[PDB]
């Protein structure tokens, strides 16, 4: 449980980090920084939604706030997951328990462990709703320790 944060090498999926922090005022034309930031935004779009979303549907306001550097990658993934296209795709078409399970597999990278964990998240879905479900998944200590 100390090694939740250790990334797998060549035996699992690759992990994308936003470590370069896209920093520039008076940026070079052939700056390599924006291109890697586009790679990371690409990666967040296809890990949250699964696929690259259609061209009219992607959020440009959260991409712009990330490339300017005011929000973190965690809050950017929270703004991707609390969007209308994500909830119309995954939360509004499905059963509530199946939506809890699939949103947990999308945002935490793993299926749920047991019943307490599902009685606690679907209670957050009960008294508060889907937005607090995304907020409680992104809050969790496994998210903080893993990513």
């Amino acid at each position: 449980p100390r090694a939740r944060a250790t990334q797998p090498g060549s035996l699992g999926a690759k992990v994308f980090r936003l470590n370069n922090e896209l920093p520039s005022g008076k940026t070079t034309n052939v700056s390599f920084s924006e291109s890697a930031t586009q790679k990371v935004i690409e990666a967040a779009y296809r890990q949250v939604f699964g696929r690259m979303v259609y061209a009219g549907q992607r959020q440009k306001v959260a991409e712009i706030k990330l490339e300017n550097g005011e929000i973190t990658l965690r809050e950017f993934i929270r703004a991707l997951a609390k969007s209308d296209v994500f909830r119309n795709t995954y939360w509004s078409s499905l059963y509530v328990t199946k939506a809890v399970e699939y949103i947990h597999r999308r945002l935490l990278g793993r299926p749920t462990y047991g019943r307490q964990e599902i009685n606690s998240y679907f209670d957050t879905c009960a008294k508060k709703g889907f937005y607090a479900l995304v907020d409680a998944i992104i809050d969790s200590k496994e998210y903080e320790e893993a990513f």
Binding site: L18, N19, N20, E21, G69, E70, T72, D139, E144
Partner: protein, 65 residues
């Protein structure tokens, strides 16, 4: 309602293969509704908070935020 904050957060217990200058000097924009929770998180790691200020709508807005 949104708090601009900047802060310094040190690594707690392990050496780091990554660079993490962006992890150590965090300046970001935290909305109001999650600010209690994110403050609690910064205090739970142990790092200090250097600045807190809300750059959005005025303190005092009972209707409309």
């Amino acid at each position: 309602r949104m708090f601009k904050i900047t802060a310094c957060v040190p690594s707690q217990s392990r050496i780091r293969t990554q660079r993490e200058l962006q992890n150590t000097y965090f300046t970001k924009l935290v909305p109001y509704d999650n600010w209690f929770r994110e403050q609690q998180r910064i205090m739970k790691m142990g790092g200090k908070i250097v600045k807190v200020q809300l750059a959005t709508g005025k303190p005092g807005t009972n209707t409309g935020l």
